[PDB]
Design a binder for this molecule. Structure first.
Ligand code: SF4
Lengths: 50, 77, 89, 99, 99
């Protein structure tokens, strides 16, 4: 059987000048509880002397 | 160098309003005059102003550089 | 072009000698909801709401929790991206 | 991986029965300016408090797909996220002779 | 300055809908609901399956089972709330049913 088909339009926003992370995870594993995302990052690229 | 009216982070995440300055470095738009500040079509360069709304940005086809973050108000609710 | 000139040493030292050489660091207010869990102004480990709040700035290596821009639940597609897909046993 | 943009994934275990699986799609706004990025790849991403990758290469959580965009003026929108879609219901049986 | 009243009253240009009821946060209907009556295990069982729709920020499910008597009255046999897309019913009676 062939049931239907969908034409999908993705996100078209670039989010300039912001550092963002997107996560897609199968949710049956964690059960009822919500997931709390924490990241271990470095931070701003500053301007230092030559 | 006085610090009376200044708050440091200074950039607000808004759901429907763009915080950039029009034709600035961050908006990155440079082209013919398109619309008014009330989303009315125009061609005179003197009275071309962005309304900071999503339609005002769509007039420029510059949706990519939109300052605000759409559909936050669904989550904040 | 007249007046009285005073000595500020006794007035300045009233707080402490240290405050004359360097300002004092700020401490967040105490809320009893935390059960004595103590907070600081330069760390945050949880995910906060977005609208009406500022975009944070990160200056050094640290564990971070970040404001949410989107969150949804849907049904996952069976295809894993390759040409071959096998459904079921 | 790269500094400007990155991608990673841990493979999902195959199912046995004919059952569907939910999927959680989250976007987080970490900081403002150009930041250097993760310290150790996927091991620096923590769900609840568990690293996605163990201290070694062994995986702790299977099925996670992470996209990292360091703050830049010119960057591409995150991949795999959708805004809207329209569907047309066919409901027509496929037979051998007529595709 | 009396001239500022007309400047204030003109307001601004707002984009969107005043009603804004096209898409709130009410979840849509579940996608594919099917009930299967199997005697493989030696008993009569009902296997209910559905597919999660696009729900914002978490979703859970509510199930009601109703016995449709011959008269036309519908009795309520049981109710359940679960977060798993599949549910099984056992030890049922002889009448018709609706989920
Ligand atoms: S709405 Fe679009 S065109 Fe107008 S200032 Fe913002 S980014 Fe620029």
């Amino acid at each position: 059987l062939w049931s239907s088909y969908t034409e999908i339009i993705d996100v078209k926003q670039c989010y300039p000048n912001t550092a963002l992370v997107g996560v897609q995870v199968d949710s049956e594993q964690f059960g009822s509880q919500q997931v709390s995302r924490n990241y271990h990052l470095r931070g701003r690229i500053l301007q230092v002397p030559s | 160098t006085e610090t009376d009216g200044a708050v440091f982070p200074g950039r607000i995440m808004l759901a429907n309003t763009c915080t950039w300055t029009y034709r600035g470095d961050e908006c990155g738009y440079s082209g013919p005059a398109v619309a008014d500040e009330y989303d009315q079509p125009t061609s005179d360069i003197t009275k071309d102003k962005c309304s900071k709304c999503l339609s005002g940005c769509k007039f420029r086809n510059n949706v990519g550089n939109f300052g605000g973050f759409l559909s936050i108000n669904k989550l904040s609710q | 072009m007249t007046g009285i000139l005073f000595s500020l040493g006794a007035s300045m030292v009233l707080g402490g000698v240290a405050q004359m050489l360097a300002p004092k660091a700020r401490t967040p207010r105490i809320q009893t909801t935390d059960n004595g869990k103590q907070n600081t102004y330069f760390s945050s480990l949880d995910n906060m709401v977005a609208q009406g709040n500022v975009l944070p700035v990160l200056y050094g290596e640290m564990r971070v929790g970040s404001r949410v821009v989107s969150q949804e639940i849907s049904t996952a597609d069976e295809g894993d991206g390759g040409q071959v897909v096998v459904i079921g046993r | 991986m790269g500094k400007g943009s990155s991608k990673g994934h841990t493979p999902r275990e195959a199912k046995d029965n004919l059952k569907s699986t939910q999927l959680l799609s989250v976007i987080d706004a970490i900081s403002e300016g150009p930041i250097e990025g993760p310290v150790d790849g996927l091991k620096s991403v923590l769900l609840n408090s568990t690293p996605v990758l163990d201290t070694e290469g062994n995986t702790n959580i299977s099925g996670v797909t992470v996209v990292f965009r360091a703050g830049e003026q010119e960057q591409t929108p995150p991949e795999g996220f959708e805004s809207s879609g329209s569907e047309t219901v066919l409901g027509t049986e496929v037979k051998y002779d007529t595709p | 300055v009396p001239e500022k009243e007309a400047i204030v009253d003109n307001g601004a240009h707002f984009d969107g809908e005043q009603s804004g009821t096209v898409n709130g946060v009410t979840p849509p209907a579940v996608q594919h609901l099917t009930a299967e009556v199997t005697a493989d295990s030696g008993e009569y069982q009902v296997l209910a399956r559905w597919d999660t729709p696009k729900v914002v920020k978490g979703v859970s499910f509510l199930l009601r089972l109703t016995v449709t008597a011959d008269d036309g009255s519908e009795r309520l046999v049981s109710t359940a709330r679960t977060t798993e897309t599949t549910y099984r019913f056992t030890q049922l009676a002889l009448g018709n049913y609706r989920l």
